[PDB]
Amino acid sequence: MNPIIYTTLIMTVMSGTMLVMISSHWLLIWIGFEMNLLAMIPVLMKNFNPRATEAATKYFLTQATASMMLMMAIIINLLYSGQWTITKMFNPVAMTMMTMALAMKLGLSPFHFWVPEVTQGISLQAGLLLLTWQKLAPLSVLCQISQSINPNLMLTMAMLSILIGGWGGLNQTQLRKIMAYSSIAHMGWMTAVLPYNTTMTILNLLIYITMTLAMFMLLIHSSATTTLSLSHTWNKMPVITSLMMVTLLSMGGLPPLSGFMPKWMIIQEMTKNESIIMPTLMAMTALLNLYFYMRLAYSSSLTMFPSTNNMKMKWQFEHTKQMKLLPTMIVLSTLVLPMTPALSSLN
Amino acid sequence: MTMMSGRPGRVPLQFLPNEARSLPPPKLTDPRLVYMGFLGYCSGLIDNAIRRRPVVSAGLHRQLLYVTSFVFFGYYLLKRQDYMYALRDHDMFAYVKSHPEDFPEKDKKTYGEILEEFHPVR
Amino acid sequence: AGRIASFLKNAWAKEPVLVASFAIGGLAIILPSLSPYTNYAIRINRATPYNYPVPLRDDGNMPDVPSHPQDPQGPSLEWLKNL
Amino acid sequence: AKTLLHKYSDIPEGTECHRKAYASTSIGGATGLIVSAYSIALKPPASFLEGVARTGRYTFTSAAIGAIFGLTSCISAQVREKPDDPLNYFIGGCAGGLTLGARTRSYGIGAAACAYMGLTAALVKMGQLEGWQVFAEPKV
Amino acid sequence: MTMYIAFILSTIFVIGFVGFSSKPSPIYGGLGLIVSGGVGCGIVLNFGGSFLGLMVFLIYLGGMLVVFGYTTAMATEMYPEVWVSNKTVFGAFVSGLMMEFCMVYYALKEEEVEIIFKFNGLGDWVIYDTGDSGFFSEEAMGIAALYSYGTWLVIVTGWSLLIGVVVIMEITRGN
Amino acid sequence: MNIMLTLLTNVTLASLLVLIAFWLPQLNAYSEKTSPYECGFDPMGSARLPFSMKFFLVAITFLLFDLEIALLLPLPWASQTNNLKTMLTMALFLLILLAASLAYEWTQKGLEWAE
Amino acid sequence: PGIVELPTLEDLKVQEVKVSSSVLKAAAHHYGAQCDKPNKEFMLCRWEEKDPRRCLEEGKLVNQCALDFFRQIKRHCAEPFTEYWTCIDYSGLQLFRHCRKQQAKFDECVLDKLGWVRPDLGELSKVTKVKTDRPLPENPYHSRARPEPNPEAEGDLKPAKHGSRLFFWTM
Amino acid sequence: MPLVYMNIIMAFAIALAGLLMYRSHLMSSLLCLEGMMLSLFIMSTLIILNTHFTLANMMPIILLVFAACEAALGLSLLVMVSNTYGTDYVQNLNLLQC
Amino acid sequence: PFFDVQKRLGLDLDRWMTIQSAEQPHKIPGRCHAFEKEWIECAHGIGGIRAEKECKIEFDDFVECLLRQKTMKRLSAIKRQRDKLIKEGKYTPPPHHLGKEDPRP
Ligand SMILES: CCCCCCCCCCCCCCCCCC(=O)OC[C@H](COP(=O)([O-])OCC(O)COP(=O)([O-])OC[C@@H](COC(=O)CCCCCCCCCCCCCCCCC)OC(=O)CCCCCCCCCCCCCCCCC)OC(=O)CCCCCCCCCCCCCCCCC
Ligand SMILES: CCCCCCCCCCCCCCCCCC(=O)OC[C@H](COP(=O)([O-])OCC(O)COP(=O)([O-])OC[C@@H](COC(=O)CCCCCCCCCCCCCCCCC)OC(=O)CCCCCCCCCCCCCCCCC)OC(=O)CCCCCCCCCCCCCCCCC
Ligand SMILES: CCCCCCCCCCCCCCCCC[C@@H](O)O[C@H](CO[C@H](O)CCCCCCCCCCCCCCC)COP(=O)(O)OCC[N+](C)(C)C
Numbered sequence A: 001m002n003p004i005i006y007t008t009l010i011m012t013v014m015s016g017t018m019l020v021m022i023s024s025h026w027l028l029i030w031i032g033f034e035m036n037l038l039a040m041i042p043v044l045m046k047n048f049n050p051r052a053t054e055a056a057t058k059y060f061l062t063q064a065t066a067s068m069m070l071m072m073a074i075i076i077n078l079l080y081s082g083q084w085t086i087t088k089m090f091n092p093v094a095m096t097m098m099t100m101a102l103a104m105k106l107g108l109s110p111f112h113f114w115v116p117e118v119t120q121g122i123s124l125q126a127g128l129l130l131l132t133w134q135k136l137a138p139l140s141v142l143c144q145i146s147q148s149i150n151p152n153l154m155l156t157m158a159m160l161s162i163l164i165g166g167w168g169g170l171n172q173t174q175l176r177k178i179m180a181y182s183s184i185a186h187m188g189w190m191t192a193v194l195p196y197n198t199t200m201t202i203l204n205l206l207i208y209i210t211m212t213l214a215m216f217m218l219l220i221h222s223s224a225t226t227t228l229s230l231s232h233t234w235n236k237m238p239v240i241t242s243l244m245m246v247t248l249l250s251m252g253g254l255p256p257l258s259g260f261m262p263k264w265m266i267i268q269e270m271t272k273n274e275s276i277i278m279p280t281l282m283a284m285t286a287l288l289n290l291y292f293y294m295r296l297a298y299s300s301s302l303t304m305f306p307s308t309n310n311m312k313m314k315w316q317f318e319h320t321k322q323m324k325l326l327p328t329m330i331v332l333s334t335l336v337l338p339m340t341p342a343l344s345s346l347n
Numbered sequence B: 001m002t003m004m005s006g007r008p009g010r011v012p013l014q015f016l017p018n019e020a021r022s023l024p025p026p027k028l029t030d031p032r033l034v035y036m037g038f039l040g041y042c043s044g045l046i047d048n049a050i051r052r053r054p055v056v057s058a059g060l061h062r063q064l065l066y067v068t069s070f071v072f073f074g075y076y077l078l079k080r081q082d083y084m085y086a087l088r089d090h091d092m093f094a095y096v097k098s099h100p101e102d103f104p105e106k107d108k109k110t111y112g113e114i115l116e117e118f119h120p121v122r
Numbered sequence C: 001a002g003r004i005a006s007f008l009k010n011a012w013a014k015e016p017v018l019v020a021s022f023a024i025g026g027l028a029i030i031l032p033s034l035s036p037y038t039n040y041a042i043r044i045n046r047a048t049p050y051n052y053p054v055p056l057r058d059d060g061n062m063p064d065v066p067s068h069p070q071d072p073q074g075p076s077l078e079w080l081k082n083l
Numbered sequence D: 001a002k003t004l005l006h007k008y009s010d011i012p013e014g015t016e017c018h019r020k021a022y023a024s025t026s027i028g029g030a031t032g033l034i035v036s037a038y039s040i041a042l043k044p045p046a047s048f049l050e051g052v053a054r055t056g057r058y059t060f061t062s063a064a065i066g067a068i069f070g071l072t073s074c075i076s077a078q079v080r081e082k083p084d085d086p087l088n089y090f091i092g093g094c095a096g097g098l099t100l101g102a103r104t105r106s107y108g109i110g111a112a113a114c115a116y117m118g119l120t121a122a123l124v125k126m127g128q129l130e131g132w133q134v135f136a137e138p139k140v
Numbered sequence E: 001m002t003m004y005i006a007f008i009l010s011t012i013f014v015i016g017f018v019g020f021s022s023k024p025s026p027i028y029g030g031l032g033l034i035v036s037g038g039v040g041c042g043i044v045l046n047f048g049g050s051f052l053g054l055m056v057f058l059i060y061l062g063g064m065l066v067v068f069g070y071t072t073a074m075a076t077e078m079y080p081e082v083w084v085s086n087k088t089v090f091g092a093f094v095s096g097l098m099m100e101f102c103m104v105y106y107a108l109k110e111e112e113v114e115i116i117f118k119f120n121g122l123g124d125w126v127i128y129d130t131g132d133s134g135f136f137s138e139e140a141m142g143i144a145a146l147y148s149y150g151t152w153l154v155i156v157t158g159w160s161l162l163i164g165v166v167v168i169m170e171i172t173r174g175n
Numbered sequence F: 001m002n003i004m005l006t007l008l009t010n011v012t013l014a015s016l017l018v019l020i021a022f023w024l025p026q027l028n029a030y031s032e033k034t035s036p037y038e039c040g041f042d043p044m045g046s047a048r049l050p051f052s053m054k055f056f057l058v059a060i061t062f063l064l065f066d067l068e069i070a071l072l073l074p075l076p077w078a079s080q081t082n083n084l085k086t087m088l089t090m091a092l093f094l095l096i097l098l099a100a101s102l103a104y105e106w107t108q109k110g111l112e113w114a115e
Numbered sequence G: 001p002g003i004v005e006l007p008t009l010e011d012l013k014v015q016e017v018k019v020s021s022s023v024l025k026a027a028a029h030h031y032g033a034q035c036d037k038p039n040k041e042f043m044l045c046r047w048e049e050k051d052p053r054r055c056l057e058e059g060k061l062v063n064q065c066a067l068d069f070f071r072q073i074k075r076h077c078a079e080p081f082t083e084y085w086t087c088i089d090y091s092g093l094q095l096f097r098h099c100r101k102q103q104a105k106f107d108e109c110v111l112d113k114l115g116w117v118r119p120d121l122g123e124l125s126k127v128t129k130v131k132t133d134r135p136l137p138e139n140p141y142h143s144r145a146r147p148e149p150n151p152e153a154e155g156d157l158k159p160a161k162h163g164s165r166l167f168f169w170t171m
Numbered sequence H: 001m002p003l004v005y006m007n008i009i010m011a012f013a014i015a016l017a018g019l020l021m022y023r024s025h026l027m028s029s030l031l032c033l034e035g036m037m038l039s040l041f042i043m044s045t046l047i048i049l050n051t052h053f054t055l056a057n058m059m060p061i062i063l064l065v066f067a068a069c070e071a072a073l074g075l076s077l078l079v080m081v082s083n084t085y086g087t088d089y090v091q092n093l094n095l096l097q098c
Numbered sequence I: 001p002f003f004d005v006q007k008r009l010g011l012d013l014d015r016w017m018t019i020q021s022a023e024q025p026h027k028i029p030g031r032c033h034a035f036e037k038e039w040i041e042c043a044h045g046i047g048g049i050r051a052e053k054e055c056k057i058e059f060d061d062f063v064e065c066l067l068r069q070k071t072m073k074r075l076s077a078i079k080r081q082r083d084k085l086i087k088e089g090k091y092t093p094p095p096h097h098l099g100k101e102d103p104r105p
């Protein structure tokens, strides 16, 4: 692919997301989604091979079905109230269809199956984009229509997402599928607090995005897509594996690391309403994500796996391309808890 | 739920309303600013470590820029956070003042007139 | 200024269709900004009375509004008859 | 739907045990039907008759568990003359767990299901007594 | 009640939808979609939407021509399936027909809420306008307002079409 | 009403012509007469086998260019607005975008058929 | 929700203008020149009251003015008007352009007999002013009293008491 | 709602069910997607015409445009799939699991 | 979530098409212009929570104009009673209803 064409496609993806974020008209929001998908399909196919083509096809089918349901919900809402402005969604059937369409776009359970497959079928850069930038538009719409949400449906989907993310991640040796299941669980956490406080949703999204960016950038720096290939990195660059171990611990939600901050905050918010059983269940379930993060840390940093002879040659060369934002991303992923009250600036 | 998005008079993308100028600014020795500078210094050290350069001595200009940028952003972040908390307190006090029926000050009782059950430990 | 003349000659000798298309498109783009009759077209469009003209209530302080269709006040279409 | 839930919950605890057992059986049957639908969708049974067999097996298991739970809980509440007591729900849950164990023909499944279902049913009864909310409506 | 023309056209619309949704073979699916496009054009015409009906008919005719070519190229087999050549396709078709007939009977003999709300019938003539004015077509004016009011829509639409050309070329480049 | 009657009349006339064609003459159909025609020799394969399309990219581009026709059709009515400058700017913008898309597909060998 | 007030049938009776569309079109310009005042009064009533039940007398006056206009036209130029409207009526689109001789004869007759001048192009489409004693309605939409807004934000902004007050943080 | 509205909604539901239930050909599912788009066009046009929402009359045309884009996208992907397998069966898209 | 770029810059990217009571070409009015105008003026500035209760009457009138459910219910009741009366034979329906009416322009 031409670099000019790649830049144009990335800019079109971002423009579709921005159009979703700045629009007041439902038609313009739908157009933003369409433009984002149209530009996103070729980016997933940048390195051409059958797996990338399969991932792109599955992604297109899922997102096109979601957009059809989105448009039908908009039209039903218009039928029962001649309104185009994104507001309290005057019809409940239309609101149910809207919620299901947005959940399918986000990959929330039980519309979760496509996320591990698409993530595994594409490159690490495409996976970074898909798991970070592609969450902004549906979450922005959900934040805008939160007051009309049905808490039962969204809470059911969020709890299912957390459970399924943990259970599915428990079974993986491929790093991209691990990241996808982690994303599913974190989306569940984000949507669990949405009917109560959208500021907490934004805070969780920001912290998750920072940690995911650090994770994907560390995985690109050490060209590993499997557990066994990541188990070699200690014999080439131990600093990368140590930073990865601390980042995994933060993603597990352990204090005093930054990944503990959202869950903590969310739990507190849920106890400001009554909502006692659900946060307890959510934390006990997030223990599963912590377990498979810890297994990855065992494989890559806390023990030393056997290496190969040809690795000696790799000792003689340095990394050519350097990521300028990786150190700041790591620091923000780990040492940010003491600045928790700054979340007031989010609302 | 969104508490403060529809608060009347809010300018969409301001980040710092003019009213916030009536609040005392954070001191330059604020411990939160010191921690932000510490975060910048840690970022510089990690940058040195990843690039296989001497961690403490490699780039002093780069480390200085890291610390300066973190402090510069942290100052305005702290200003906005303090403004938001001041706004919350202002609205809470005004609402309590305008709805006295929902916030009554009931008569005070001393502990010599309050009957509390005693539970012996044995 | 000399190489572009050769380029134009070569284009006219090899792809006259594209030369004519580009010339016509450029003329269509740039000419309307230089014509004095575009505003005449705007005025003609504005002078077409699709809807009924609802009369205004006389408060006694509108000397620019006619009291009858044939009164000298109000807009004139005499420019349109000479076009 | 919530119609079945209301049909079960409208009857008082230690009264009309047959009707409560019927309502619990209906709830269990609906749950088993949904489970079988998802199972057939995600794991095709290679034959239509095999799919019918799996649906019937799952639905009968669920309906039997529900019927046993409802009958045992109501009978315990009526015999002890102690409604609003989580012990009746615990006994019903263990009876349902033993029914599941017999249905799958496994002693470990029976014991684990007795313990866990009894505990869960007692917790549900405590929630009804104290007003615990699973899906809390937004308040603040 | 008046000639049932709109109801008949909408029923044929649903029938064509069932025809292509049972998925016999993309040739016959395209035929069913063409039939649906024609009856939808008729339905929209009966409400005063001449331009929109004609436009949607033309667009779907072009789309189905391209789909026919692609079916000949990439979606064929030795024995293409029709609605009576396979038990799955026939079952889906008959189920769709029976569902449509049951819904029609339910909403016509009774007045009950299928999913959203209730409906009694009376023909679609009741909710018309009796509006008496105009030397122009209102739909034409609204559609023509795209070039004076809908500048933003024109911008985003043109950008999307250019991006679509670039996108299809990138996708089919291969390598 | 009149258009429906016209359509019914035309379809009925065509159907009656087909009916007359199939029921008036004498029919003698046998297996060799109704066999597929391939210039006197039996075909090797089936006509239902995949037939390669060498101009598939042009077909997709035709799908995309067909919608610009729907976009540009209301121009006779759009030419009657009071703000003619905005309308002319937007119509020329759309036509320039279409020409740019054609030029892009042309220069990248997109109009050449596959070999 | 209350009953709807409707005029009686007897109140709706008026002498009718029973000439076809071609006849009306042939005399449209002179009709708009002569009967302008009652028509403008009726249109102002119609657009201000937003209720057809409140402008019935104005409609009756409009009918009376049209009847007087057509009575005069019959009294002075029966034949030229008949020829002109027959010419207009033959056309399928009822076009003015195809019959100018008959229009010229009718115009000459009305000018000489009644001193009537055909309006120039663009004069009948003017926005005019009308003097009426009808009071301007105050609530033509029958609107309810609007709900009162949330009061306001007032006072000077002071720092939050004891800071954020979030768990252990003292700032 | 009139009977016509229910008929159009039923058509949309039928097309959605047809899309969600794959048989073998990707082309048939793409046809179901196009049918859903057509049903949405008809429903929106009927609503906009009924309420005399003049400026909304341009909305259905916009829908069609993006429908075409979506239609083109799908076809492009199908080409690649066919070039990999010689067929457009959804059974062949099974290299990636959960 | 929502960055109100239009409000900050005063651009009006899409607000012209959000409601039916907003500046149509040639001043063509929507079928329910007055009802929507009244509901909007009622609900302006008080927030969604208060508007959902205090502007329920205007919204109900607007929805009745949009979908006309009660009007069809009333018409169906009248028609059913008339049909029963004629079937019993006591209706004695008028000439104007039967098409024998003396039309007026
Ligand atoms: C809570 C209170 C405050 C605490 C704050 C939080 C903690 C401290 C801040 C954290 C960040 C700071 C450092 C970041 C960069 C470090 C990266 C690194 O590689 O270090 C190597 C570097 C040595 O490299 P070198 O000198 O170039 O030559 C040696 C070779 O490079 C040889 O290098 P090599 O690569 O060949 O060696 C391989 C080695 C290389 O691997 C490593 O070195 C690991 C480093 C990972 C960085 C930490 C991750 C990100 C930060 C998150 C920390 C979370 C803390 C919360 C608690 C949870 C714990 C995880 O890997 C291994 O051997 C595998 C060991 C497996 C164990 C896995 C455990 C790792 C996680 C532990 C993290 C604990 C915190 C940091 C510990 C100190 C690190 C220096 O260490 C340093 O010398 C820098 C540290 C000291 C500088 C600061 C001193 C300031 C100036 C002095 C005056 C003080 C002023 C006071 C004012 C008053 C005036 C008088
Ligand atoms: C921190 C401190 C420590 C804390 C934790 C440490 C202590 C707790 C954990 C350790 C003990 C827990 C183990 C639980 C049961 C484990 C079974 C198992 O793992 O299954 C897999 C394992 C795998 O087997 P499989 O693969 O499915 O098939 C092959 C079979 O093995 C082949 O089977 P088979 O053909 O050889 O024969 C099996 C057959 C027959 O088995 C035989 O052939 C030999 C006969 C043995 C049965 C003994 C029953 C009659 C004697 C009991 C006398 C009274 C009990 C003592 C209390 C006196 C009170 C003053 O058994 C049955 O048919 C079951 C029918 C039920 C009758 C027994 C159940 C009575 C429950 C106790 C009620 C107590 C209520 C509270 C009382 C309060 C006052 C103190 O199953 C077995 O092999 C064992 C089967 C028999 C086990 C049942 C014995 C119950 C033991 C007492 C339970 C109390 C703890 C739980 C209470 C809380 C629950 C709410
Ligand atoms: C894991 C660490 C998280 C860090 C996340 C990235 C940090 C660096 C990014 C820098 C942000 C640049 C923004 C500054 C330019 C001004 C933009 C300004 O106009 O935006 C305002 C918005 O301000 C921003 O939201 C503030 C950004 C600051 C975020 C930091 C809070 C993180 C939580 C505490 C963790 C400690 C952070 C430590 C920092 C290094 C407008 O508000 P508004 O248009 O009405 O909001 C729209 C959305 N609403 C209405 C639905 C709410």
Ligand SMILES: CCCCCCCC/C=C/CCCCCCCC(=O)OC[C@H](COP(=O)(O)OCCN)OC(=O)CCCCCCC/C=C/CCCCCCCC
Residues within 6 Å of the ligand: C008, C011, C015, C018, C019, C021, C022, C023, C024, C025, C026, C029, F096, F099, F100, F102, F103, F106, F107
């Ligand atoms: C008095 C001076 C007149 C000035 C007129 C204006 C400038 C005229 C010259 C501008 C460019 C003229 C044509 C381009 C140069 C010559 C053609 C060329 O580049 O190579 C030909 C080659 C075609 O030949 P092949 O198909 O490759 O042959 C294969 C078999 N051998 O051209 C190309 O590769 C690309 C052609 C792109 C065509 C552009 C698409 C259509 C655009 C025109 C529509 C209207 C445009 C109006 C808007 C623009 C306003 C300024």
